[PDB]
Amino acid sequence: EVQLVESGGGLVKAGGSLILSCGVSNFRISAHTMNWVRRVPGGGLEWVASISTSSTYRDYADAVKGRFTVSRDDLEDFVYLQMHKMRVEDTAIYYCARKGSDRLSDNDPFDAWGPGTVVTVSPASTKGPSVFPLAPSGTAALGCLVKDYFPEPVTVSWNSGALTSGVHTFPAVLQSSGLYSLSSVVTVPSSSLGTQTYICNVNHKPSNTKVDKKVEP
C-alpha cells in the first residue's frame, strides 16, 4: 500500500538544471532517511544522495557532490533533488527510495522505491543559428531571420557596423522546440537596392559561430 512517486524529469541540455520531487502515500517520511538512486543505460544502479531524519546529514555520490542538493519537507512529505551543471552521464531513471519501514533500526536497506522518472541530458550545451535572408520587395525593408540557436544571445550588425540607422533587432522568441529565434530588420532608401549591398553579421559566441548573409532582391 506504501508508495512513492517522482515528478519532474525530462530533457536537459548539458550544463542545464532540473529539479525532481518525490511525494509518498500511506506512510509519513519524517522517521526515515530518504534517498535518490538512478539506473543508468548500461543497467546498473548508482546511489545519488541521502538525507537523514531532520536533515541532520546530507550525503552525495562523488560524481554529483557539489552539483546536486537533496532537501526534505516532513510536514507535507516531499523530498527534492536539485541537479545543476548536468552532464551526459547524469542520464538515467531516477528513483526516490525510503530506508527502513515499520522495521526501523540503526541501518536498514531501501525497503520501498518509486517507479522512477526519466532524465535525459543531451550532449550539446549550445547550437548555432541558421540565417535566412528577409528579401526586400520611398523606403524599403529587408532583414535576416536568425533561427534555431541556443542559448541566448545572438548579435546582429549590418555591413559590419557601418549601418546602424533604421535597424531594429527584435527580442528572441523561444520556439516550442526549445530553440530561440529572432529577426533583425533595417529600412533603406529603395533606390539604393540595385546598388548598395546589405550583409547582416550574425554572431553567436556560445557556439563560437559567425555567419554573414548577403540579402538581395
Binding site: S130, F132, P133, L134, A135, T139, A141, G143, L145, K147, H168, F170, P171, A172, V173, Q175, S181, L182, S183, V185, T187
Partner: protein, 213 residues
Amino acid sequence: AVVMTQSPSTLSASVGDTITITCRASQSIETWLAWYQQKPGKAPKLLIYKASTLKTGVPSRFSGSGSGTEFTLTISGLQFDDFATYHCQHYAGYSATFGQGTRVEIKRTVAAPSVFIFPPSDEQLKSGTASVVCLLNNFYPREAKVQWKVDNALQSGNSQESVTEQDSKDSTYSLSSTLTLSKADYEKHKVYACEVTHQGLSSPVTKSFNRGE
C-alpha cells in the same frame, strides 16, 4: 479577497513632467501598500512601502500618499531612467495581491505601422519549413493586431510575435510576426497575407504575396 485596481494602464509623458498613478483597494487596507518599479527582463524594485515611506536610495522625486482604499504614486520631474512599468501591491501577513501595472512611456504623436511581408527563402523551404515574416515598423502607441490569412483562411495558433522597446531616436515601436508552416502545408496554398490593425489606421492594412512569384 482584496482586489487592487491600478489606473491608468499606460501613461505617456515627456521628460520633466510630474505624473500620478493611482491604485484603489476593493476594501480598506490601512496603509499596507507598496509600489515597485520594473524594467523589461529585470526584477521588480521596491520603491515605497507603508503607502508613503521611501526605501533607502530611492530618489526623492518619488513619493506615495493615501490610506484606506485610495493610493497614489507621484513622480515629480520624470527622468529618462523612470520610463518603466510601476506596480502597486497590497501585502498582508500571508498573501499579497498586485494591481495590473502601469507602463510609463515617452509620449509622441500617433504613428501608423509601415507593414512589410517576407516569403520564406528557398533555402529554408528546402529544409522542410516555411517561416513567413510580417514586419510592422515604427508605430505608436504599442497596441497592434496581426492576423494571418492563407488563401483567405484566417489562421489560428501558428504564429509568434515580438516587439521592441521604444526607439531611442523616435520613440516608436516595431513588431515582428512569424507564421510557421511545414513545406507540405506551405506548398498547398498560394496567397499568403499579413493583415494589420492599429488605431492610426482607418482600415486594416494587408500585405501579401503569391507563393513562388
